[PDB]
Symmetry: none
Subunit: 266 residues, 4 copies
């Protein structure tokens, strides 16, 4: 109950709460706790722990020895960050499930009209931007071998061996969004500009293009993936899903200090 003690006085946990409740950073914590509980009740039994555990494991490799430090500077630990990813994946799972159910034929067609089928291309991934520009000037030379440039310079171990080559749709998650839209904009044998997506630098050469069908029926599972991704990144949709899940949980704010921050949702 006592947080701090001194000569002739103490600070209690409740005294600490009564001061800190007006802090906007602390108000955000109660909002995020409420989003966690509501979404845990609704979709927590549907979300596997392996979905969270793989992502927190994935994130630990990206930072490595800096991971303990950066979390402590943000005021977090292994558990609190795990809860944050879990919360984020519960909202995403809810957006996925509500979107899936609302998939219309009129929706499938809109995606179908803007869809692109398999496109083979040679991609070179880079770290240094000075290298990326130096690789690009070589790629536009008279008899420039794009394959050897990929073999010599590219960081991507999987495509590096095969002269940077890769095949992908609009629905592929294995290549970035900015990289794909650059690839579809090119003519065949066209080399892209330096595409950017502690970030990564890409150059793409368009090799092949495949014909798209009239019949939508065979592209159903891939158009589904495009529409879901669009809904995952439509913030107006994501905020509605949060708002509607909170309204369905029937949250009552007991202390009036936290009344305004829930107004966006309630």
């Amino acid at each position: 109950a006592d947080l701090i003690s001194m000569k002739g006085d103490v600070i209690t946990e409740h005294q600490f709460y009564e001061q800190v409740k007006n802090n906007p950073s602390a108000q955000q914590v109660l909002l995020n706790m409420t989003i966690q509980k509501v979404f845990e009740k609704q979709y927590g039994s549907e979300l596997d722990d392996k979905e969270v555990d793989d992502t927190i494991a994935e994130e630990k490799k990206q930072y490595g020895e800096n991971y303990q430090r950066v979390l402590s500077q943000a005021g977090m630990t292994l558990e609190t960050r795990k809860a944050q990813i879990r919360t984020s994946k519960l909202v995403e799972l809810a957006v996925k499930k509500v979107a899936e159910a609302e998939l219309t034929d009129e929706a499938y067609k809109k995606a179908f009209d803007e869809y692109t089928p398999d496109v083979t291309a040679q991609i070179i991934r880079l770290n240094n931007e000075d290298k990326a520009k130096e690789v690009l000037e070589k790629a536009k030379a008279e008899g420039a071998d794009f394959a050897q440039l990929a073999k010599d310079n590219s960081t991507d171990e999987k495509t590096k061996e095969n002269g940077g080559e890769i095949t992908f749709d609009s629905a592929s998650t294995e290549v970035p969004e900015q990289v794909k839209k650059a690839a579809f904009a090119l003519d065949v044998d066209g080399v892209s500009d330096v595409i950017t997506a502690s970030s990564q630098y890409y150059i793409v050469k368009l090799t092949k293009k495949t014909e798209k069908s009239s019949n939508i029926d065979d592209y159903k599972e891939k158009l589904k993936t495009v529409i879901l991704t669009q809904k995952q990144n439509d913030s107006t949709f994501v905020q509605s899903i949060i708002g509607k899940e909170l309204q369905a949980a029937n949250i009552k704010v007991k202390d009036q200090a936290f009344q305004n921050i829930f107004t966006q949702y309630i």
Copy 2:
């Protein structure tokens, strides 16, 4: 008590405490609560309430009609800010005492040596260097008061012939103007002095100069103010006084989560 309720669950105050205690902005609130209680205990009787009201009055004038908006951004009200300002003055007061107590004869000797008593002069300030050179050829040959009235940009001195009295400790006039002025003879005109958002140009005419007395007591309080004002703005000094006052209060941090924000002090 409960803070949020929903279908078959509540977020309790203690659960909110357990999440929010790691929040860096929250950790600052407890530290400030601890500083507020200790400094009130020791220096509260000495501090008069009127100069706390002078600061919040000045602060209300600065922001004007942005004050409630700026206060809400910080997560505060007029009352809680007035408490925060009171704490600042209690720390300021304690810092002043320890600075007063650490005054040596050597610091006075040094401050006395570097001090130059009040001189009276006439200054012309200009934005353009080549206009300052044009005005200087007139000034060095002349009615200096009129030249200031017609050319000077300093709106404070301009109207009364560019007239000004200052000593070495003066913050009204720049270092280079002061030093240039002290080095002049009476009725002498300086060269263009350049003070360094935007650099300015100056022409100084010395009217009068006070003779610096032998005895140090003649400028005792003026030198005391120089030495204390310097210590008041040293963050390292202020943070050391806070630390020593917290150690004299015999603080025990009971919750491990706050241990780190206190190690700098205790």
Copy 3:
């Protein structure tokens, strides 16, 4: 030792003048400053290039102009020993930056990261009169770039439609202007902000229009360098800190004060 003054049937020698001048407070400071110079040259001298010292004294000569020679006399300096003083100052602040860097804790970085607010773009309109600021405020309830271009006293911002980018740590913008701007929403106009009438500056009045706001990241490393500089420049301007480093460095030299007259001026350090 030589003779400094000669009269009929008597002289003042250099040793006799020394034996009197050693009690002069100003003279005791000169021995202290000669001591600081020698120690800081031995330690950090090799690191400092002479070009930067030549830049400072060249800048300084332009600032004073033909006043400079006259001004150096009053400071107890010739051109040579001023150039040496500037060098010593640079060697001190160089040494203070190293120890400040070496004493950086994670809590210092964390506290700075918490209090720091990232770059926001905005348009400002500085004004001399209060009644004119009330006039422009109601008009700016609008093309804020035009209202800046016509009315703004700040000639730096006026050219680019009043626009400016700044952190919380920017000293280019006043504290109350920054705090007012961070409290706005995007495309939001503040009421009149007032920099009050003090001795140095006359009272200024500001109207702020927030244009862009960076979202504050979760990763400290995105702002590490800006947070590093604000913590270091704080310690650089702390007189107590600089004095402690000087005192530490003088203690490391193992200085023996031979003449008793100077013992007290060294006691603050040793």
Copy 4:
């Protein structure tokens, strides 16, 4: 020459210290004072007994008490140099007196005579508070005996025990100029209003007024002492005497650093 400071692999010597310190304005003042001291000690020194200085030293030492060592330190000085300063001061005034005596003229005597007011006996009640002064002012004007009012109320310890009584002329420095001019304007046995000197508050009663004689010969020696004392307190006169005495010594400045500070005299 000897070593002042030593450290690892280096020393600062006396000559090195001299070559630096000689450009310092305060150090240049010391040498000018040493030169004034040696010249005046050579010419006039035999006339001044050290008892004269020792009496003045014992006066200061008895005043400040056991803070005497500290107040000398605070003034950038010691017993030996302060003793030398008093000595040099007394030899200058002694030398100035001789020139003043020889330059006495009947014009000078006539001007002193016109401004002179002869001996006046008056009872002064020195008061620290203005409220307490106006109370005693009422009591004196009523019936009342003025000697007891001074005994039972005056702060000046010397006059208090003698019934506030003191005798003086226009020359006497032991009573203030505002009090003297008030006293000369009263009628015999008349009481003044409250007088402010600057802040102490005086009430005068004129006991005895000497009628001023028509003959200058009746005040010859007193008027002489006025003229000489006036020449003593005239800074321009004193400086000129020091200046001319330095010229007579045939002073060569053997170092160009000190050339300018002597040029103020020679």
